[PDB]
Symmetry: D2
Subunit: 303 residues, 4 copies
């Protein structure tokens, strides 16, 4: 689809970021991945982000990314498919063009690698990546890549296919300035780890959707929270925060990287063969897996 079509899809519901399934040896496990993506499709997220952060983009070889995107496309149905992209410009452009070739509907551009960079340099890097493909681009403010509002405005003026903005900073002051400046030029995507913790506040900032990492393993629960959010049903949102998300957060905060590892553990507990995380992430301990299993509780998919 064209960038305006992926833009419309970004504003039509909740965003799904599937974990990437690996076998015991760490290789991509396409059959298990497709089984899980097919199961998630029943819950009708309008956009699927293949090989995003939750999908361990940062541990994939560039040549693996189109294979993962193609696998998702096999079974995702009438769903927009966005690919992760990232690293420095040379690598990012090659990844972008490779996933465009296998039929991705857009790219989510993760930070460049390692260095702190001046705004002018961020502009030049992101412009070059946007101009390398015809599909839609979402930029991702996080870590060592944080666009100021004026820099983002310049990019929007020069790159018509730049259509989305994902925030992973939690900087409420900055993101409100960005939505005030750009208005409906961009779709605004919440991108904090466990984004439901931020979603009610981010409404006021101008964000009405987000990545739901836990949709990987409790999509019914994630969909219900999202529905309550958009309906203004505060007591329902709050009940789900108190009974599910703050307990999940307690597990997540036990170790670095568990924003991904705990989500992948949840997928395994629901009976999908998602396999291990790749180093330098680590998997949950048996004790922690037990905690998560108990938390999932009434939401188990099987016995």
């Amino acid at each position: 689809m064209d960038p305006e079509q992926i833009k419309t899809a970004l504003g039509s519901g909740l965003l799904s970021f599937p974990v990437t399934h690996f076998d015991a040896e760490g290789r991509f496990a396409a059959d298990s991945y497709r089984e899980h993506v097919e199961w998630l499709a029943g819950y009708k997220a309008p956009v699927l982000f293949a090989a995003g952060g939750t999908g361990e983009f940062f541990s994939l070889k560039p040549d693996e990314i189109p294979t993962i995107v193609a696998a998702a496309k096999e079974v995702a149905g009438e769903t927009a498919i966005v690919s992760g992209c990232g690293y420095g410009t040379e690598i990012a452009v090659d990844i972008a063009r490779s996933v465009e070739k296998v039929g991705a509907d857009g790219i989510l551009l993760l930070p460049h690698y390692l260095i702190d960079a001046p705004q002018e340099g961020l502009y030049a890097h992101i412009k070059k990546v946007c101009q390398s493909v015809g599909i839609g681009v979402m930029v991702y403010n996080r870590d060592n890549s944080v666009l100021q509002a004026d820099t983002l405005a310049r990019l929007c003026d020069e790159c018509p296919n730049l259509v989305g903005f994902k925030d992973g900073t939690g900087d409420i002051g900055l993101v409100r300035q960005i939505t005030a400046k750009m208005g409906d030029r961009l779709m605004y995507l919440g991108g904090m780890p466990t984004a439901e913790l931020f979603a009610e506040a981010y409404l006021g900032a101008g964000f009405t959707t987000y990545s739901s990492a836990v949709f990987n393993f409790v999509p019914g629960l994630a969909n219900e929270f999202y529905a309550a959010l958009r309906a203004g049903e505060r007591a329902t949102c709050e009940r789900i925060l108190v009974d599910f998300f703050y307990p999940f957060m307690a597990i997540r905060n036990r170790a670095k990287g568990y924003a991904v590892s705990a989500v992948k553990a949840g997928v395994r507990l629901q009976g999908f063969n998602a396999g291990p995380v790749r180093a330098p992430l680590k998997d949950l301990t048996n004790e922690e897996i037990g905690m998560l299993e108990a938390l999932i509780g009434t939401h188990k998919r099987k016995a």
Copy 2:
């Protein structure tokens, strides 16, 4: 005033934090202060925080604080008066008791001095301050004093006069957890510098009021933004953000401490003899003062 009455006042509108006026000899200028507070009273903020952060609490002698609270009480009329309080426990308790004596309706407890502290220690410190007075207390998550939700819950169970929670961290994740845990047990007060930049997001977190530092010199505009906020008139809030608050923010970000210095400059531009900031703050340059004057524009008094 009993804690439940200050609690009600905290939920009845916008919060005012007047700058503290100093004269040429550097002392508190009570006549000038009272003139400014009397003018602000016309704009009907339900609660006035004397000697808070915007009032340069951090540069005041403990014995100056009751004097400032007393001056505010003279002219505030039907307005609740909350006093700043802070430092370590021994000093804080002395301040708290001293301002209760001159008629403060509550205290806002700023962080203790210098050190990073464990949750159990914050608990012990804040509990001792709360139990030293009968008036209402508002805690203030900021810098080296950040309460977790479970610690604040314990304080609420133990200290009935603890009735307010002010946030200066900007940690949306944490403050949403706090409002979910405590519910209507506490009044939630936005406390970021230039809090209007955060107000719409903080609604969703569970906060419907905040300190408006710029109410000091453009109270009419601050009231206009607040009314639009509570009415859900986003285009109006956004217009005021774009036309006033982000340009103000640009001036404020030129130097450390200007969250206070620029506000005080604004007060002087409106014809109040608020005087200089105390070191280690520094005042705006003449050029910067000119920028602020131009920004205030048609809100000139």
Copy 3:
């Protein structure tokens, strides 16, 4: 003494920062304090910092500080006595003048309260404090008060009684620039928590002394480390780091504020009635006190020792 005399004292050995003793009613326990200080005096630190950070300056009422300084001065012998000082300018000047009045030999100026401040404001604040007294002043780079080299040079040019610089930032790049700029105009004092962890590196930065917080309860060991440091006996320094200081660090890192709490626990373990820390610090758990007791080990204060 005059500023040049305290300056000379700062360069004559290891720096002592006694914990402040509190009684059951929470009050300053002067008898116990004086007893502890008298014991420490036997280990010959040339400068004693009363009511510094380790002495819980940040939890003292201002009127308590001259009482504490006076108590240390009574029993410290021929030892320079420096008082903690801090907060905003108005409070700091009052504190400074009050401790000068009871015969403090200098002040260590802790950061102002709460706010971040422009360099020009730091300059104005510190200058006013220095000019309020005739005794020597040591500035203290840490937290929300960090002087750049040019700002400090300006203060040195205008305040002759400013004679010392303590670092609590751990910013090697900055502190080396400072010593290159000022040279022997200032005495440079290491001020990291558990400063022995930094001492060998700080030598190259231009610092040959530091506050030894653990001197409070193992003054012999602290002296042994300092002696080896100044003599270039790396194997000895390293042994003490591996056997004592990194294990101490493990205890210290278990909770916020334990850089003070664990030291006070050590003092109590060695038989000085220092009492609890004041909130918002917390004391070590019994389990943690147990860990510190084992670590002190052969350095335990024994009834049969000769003074």
Copy 4:
């Protein structure tokens, strides 16, 4: 070269990290690179790190790295050549094996990409990279990859080819613990931006060498500072800090990334046209380059003929 031989070379002097030269089309410019490396060779740094941070590792396509290493090897003489390496494990292993194939004498392992990771994960990642090659490895504590002493000890016990430790954290407390723990098991390399600012302090921590980024364009000055450092000649070190390094730092601090961009400008000023930096770095303005030119001053290795008519 085996790992014990590169370990020995790491302890034999100052470390060189050449900028990577690009042409106007952005491509690696091997002829220019070799000319610059050949000039540097006269100053006899025992180890050259090709495609390190100063060499814009983070902006290279993985297939460029062996090409750059091979070019340096052409003209480096009897100098050890270490290659940059980095990213997540899968990419890092491919890079490591590719540069081993072209004859690198070791790899400097930069952080993995993006994420904060637990110590056990860092261990698993670095172990896998070390076991993928037979050449020497130096780990690099910086940004999102900071090994604690006990984790590093486990890596040392299991990976004999891990022989070096480079610090970019500036955490004196931690690095002194690490040298106390490992002793001569590892060679300790200073790795701060503009490492001369840290070198005297780092001696005490146990580090007697470092990467000198400015060696790229004032190697005579960098060599003199290093000799003074090792000799204990404090007044010489201090003069060079005051007259050159703190003024350099003032230029460097003008914008993000100038720790690389300013060094590359210096190389260009000395007559080696190393070309532009790759985005998202930005080059110094012509005004800023003029500031650096004035600072280089008596240390210029050429005179320019600027265009002028009548």
